[PDB]
């Protein structure tokens, strides 16, 4: 089972480090300064074509808050298999709880893939 | 897989359509005004009987903070198969980082189902 | 399957982690006071050896915000199978949105296990 991955540029850290099972770390694609109580979409510099029928889950690393003072506004990001365009680059939605500077190459979040949910039928009933 | 769904009333937007595995969007059941740094349980106007052995996870949509300035206080909501009563409606626990307003019918979060955790035994030990 | 659990000390409340399928509640290992807009890693007083090939996910309980006014800064904690050391204790990263006090034994979060992602091959490309 493979994942085709495209990098924003030749300087981005190749996350080619994985296929053992652990969540894979993602890094800021450049320097980012976020002021307290400000929102900023941090470029992760990667675009992927996930396996058919799969999706990716993105959450911050356990040390992201302590290190950068940010939280992921959407709690857990979901990247569907259809998000495989040549320009579909990933971003980490960050809300700064304190002035913070994120350096290019800094690990800020992580992800893993999972099979999408089975097809369902939402049938309306008047009483439950 | 069949999921029985009950709606709060006829004005709630029905969400049955051709599904194929993507997360499903839920919507505010009514207008909701939230002041800066205050909390509000946003009703989603739906109650469901999930498949036996399954549970649902609920997270904000990726554009939820950008549009409404709120985060989900519980990070990811977990709805168990047992939460299937006639009055077990779903809610999105919103905390606003600014004065905001979610309009009736606005897509505000999304969900998917997943098989519940397997049978496991907990064996207490003094050392690992 | 079996999960080996170690408790910090003899005064910790044994998780009543019971009910096939249900997420399991974790408790504060000691009293903790957190001032509004401040952080605090709340020890849960447990360390576990998860089944091989599995990982744990931890999120706030539905009533955590209402009860203690805190959010989990890393959104969802991810405990890998390898984090099974004798001093590999669990913590709940809490950011208080108001003055709060958590009592030893108070249930503040919950967890479940899940199979880790299948091993994947990341193939770098130049176009998607």
């Amino acid at each position: 089972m493979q994942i085709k991955i495209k990098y924003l540029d030749e300087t981005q850290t190749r996350i080619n480090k994985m296929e053992q099972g652990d969540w894979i770390d993602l890094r800021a694609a450049e320097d980012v300064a976020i002021k307290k109580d400000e929102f900023k979409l941090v470029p992760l510099g990667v675009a992927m074509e996930l396996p058919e029928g799969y999706e990716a889950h993105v959450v911050p690393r356990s040390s992201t808050y302590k290190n950068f003072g940010v939280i992921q506004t959407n709690s857990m990001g979901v990247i569907d298999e259809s998000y495989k365009g040549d320009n579909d680059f990933w971003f980490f939605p960050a809300y700064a709880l304190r002035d913070t500077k994120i350096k290019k190459g800094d690990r800020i979040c992580q992800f893993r893939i999972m099979k999408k949910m089975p097809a369902v039928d939402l049938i309306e009933v008047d009483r439950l």
Side-chain angles (χ1 to χ4, degrees), chain A residues 23-34 36-89:
Chain A
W23 285 56
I24 304 164
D25 296 318
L26 295 174
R27 305 167 157 84
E30 70 177 310
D31 276 7
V32 177
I34 309 175
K36 174 195 177 79
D37 300 325
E38 252 70 290
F39 175 65
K40 180 63 184 179
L41 284 167
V42 184
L44 298 173
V46 300
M48 293 177 233
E49 174 174 2
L50 300 167
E52 180 184 2
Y54 278 72
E55 71 191 19
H57 292 182
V58 178
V59 299
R61 298 186 58 246
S62 63
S63 68
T64 292
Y65 175 83
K66 179 261 263 63
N67 288 171
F68 312 101
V70 295
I71 54 174
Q72 186 174 156
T73 46
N74 63 355
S75 290
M76 185 177 91
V78 175
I79 291 65
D80 181 69
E81 61 177 304
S82 67
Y83 198 64
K84 50 172 162 60
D86 201 66
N87 58 342
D88 286 342
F89 286 94

Side-chain angles (χ1 to χ4, degrees), chain A residues 88-100 102 104-114:
Chain A
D88 286 342
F89 286 94
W90 296 23
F91 290 75
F92 173 86
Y95 182 91
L97 258 19
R98 70 176 169 68
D99 288 345
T100 181
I102 297 171
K104 169 171 183 162
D106 278 333
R107 304 207 305 292
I108 57 175
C109 64
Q110 49 176 168
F111 86 95
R112 65 155 287 180
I113 63 175
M114 195 185 290

